[PDB]
Design a protein around this ligand. Structure first.
Ligand SMILES: [Ca+2]
Ligand SMILES: [Ca+2]
Ligand SMILES: [Ca+2]
Ligand SMILES: [Ca+2]
Ligand code: NA
Ligand code: NA
Lengths: 203, 203
């Protein structure tokens, strides 16, 4: 029963191949490729062969996820790895799989089937996903993204997951500066501390 | 005519002495100590001998600066370096001097005396202060903190400066983790790249 983003067991331009989220693509079995393409086509309202931010805001996603302008921009920042303002099919496959994983995890953690997680339920769920933050940070993420809501509905969960993932992208961008010395092996306990610190900047 | 935070020419618990902003204290001449104390006393509405976040939100500061709940929390996060939820007189001396420097810089850059900077005027002013960000980042900082306002008034300038300074604190906290190797000399060009990346997370 594995949801850890750093441990995804296997079941393309350099921009897609050299991202931290590339292993998501390797969890997609052949039969799912065409199903994801049908989903892509649904979201691509102007049939351009690419997803634009407006289309992200109007799309339906796994589990009925929908995206605020802010979360859609996060999804762009994570998955638009050639920085062209468009999501290609390959970038979308990873975005899709990320959403699917996050949705499945939400459902598993919604044990009373309320359609929400309580704020104290957020930490262990994020830990399953590979984000090793502290309790203070977990409760702050709920306040930051819940828009005043008492609990964490699925869309709020995805907003939170998107911020965590975008912070992972920011980490890779920061640390590929050779000023900081050779790239160290990715360590999720150390990255968790980074996410703790960076989250506090949004408050 | 120097405003660079990393180059402040000289004119205490370890928590105050070992902060990146400690050189601010060394720009305070003896005669200003008692004037800053009078200011401190004004803000300390309950005479506790310490400033609390509510008092920051109700205080008047150099140049008529006032603080939103969000900016007041930033000021706490920068200057409360023993993490006790209170601003001591020593922490306040640095906060005061930071505000004074930022206010003087705003005034110098408000060449038409409009009480505002245009968004394109923000970058060179931040560069004077020692924040070496790109133009994209400068315009984003205005959108993030201006609350819809077309231009950047003094309070919006301080909100922006506070975020930049708090990101400098986050940088020191991140990089004192020995996982990232020995602490490198502070390099403002490299830190500017870090601020570019981190700002994008707020959008
Ligand atoms: Ca399209
Ligand atoms: Ca792209
Ligand atoms: Ca007080
Ligand atoms: Ca303190
Ligand atoms: Na529930
Ligand atoms: Na002006």
């Amino acid at each position: 029963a594995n949801f850890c983003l750093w441990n995804l067991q296997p079941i393309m331009p350099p921009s897609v191949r050299n991202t931290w989220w590339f292993p998501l693509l390797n969890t997609i079995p052949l039969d799912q490729y065409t199903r994801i393409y049908q989903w892509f086509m649904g979201v691509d309202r102007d049939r351009s062969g690419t997803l634009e931010i407006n289309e992200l805001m109007m799309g339906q996603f796994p589990g009925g996820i929908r995206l605020s302008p802010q979360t859609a921009l996060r999804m762009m920042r994570i998955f638009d790895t050639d920085f062209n303002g468009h999501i290609s099919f390959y970038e979308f496959m990873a975005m899709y799989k990320f959403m699917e994983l996050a949705y499945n995890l939400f459902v598993m953690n919604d044990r009373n089937r309320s359609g929400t997680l309580e704020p104290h339920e957020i930490l262990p769920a994020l830990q399953q996903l590979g984000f090793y933050i502290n309790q203070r940070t977990s409760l702050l993420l709920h306040r930051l993204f819940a828009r005043g809501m008492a609990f964490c509905d699925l869309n709020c969960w995805i907003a939170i997951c998107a911020f965590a993932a975008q912070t992972r992208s920011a980490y890779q961008m920061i640390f590929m500066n050779p000023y900081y010395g050779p790239m160290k092996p990715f360590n999720p306990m150390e990255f968790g501390k980074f996410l703790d610190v960076v989250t506090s900047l949004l408050e």
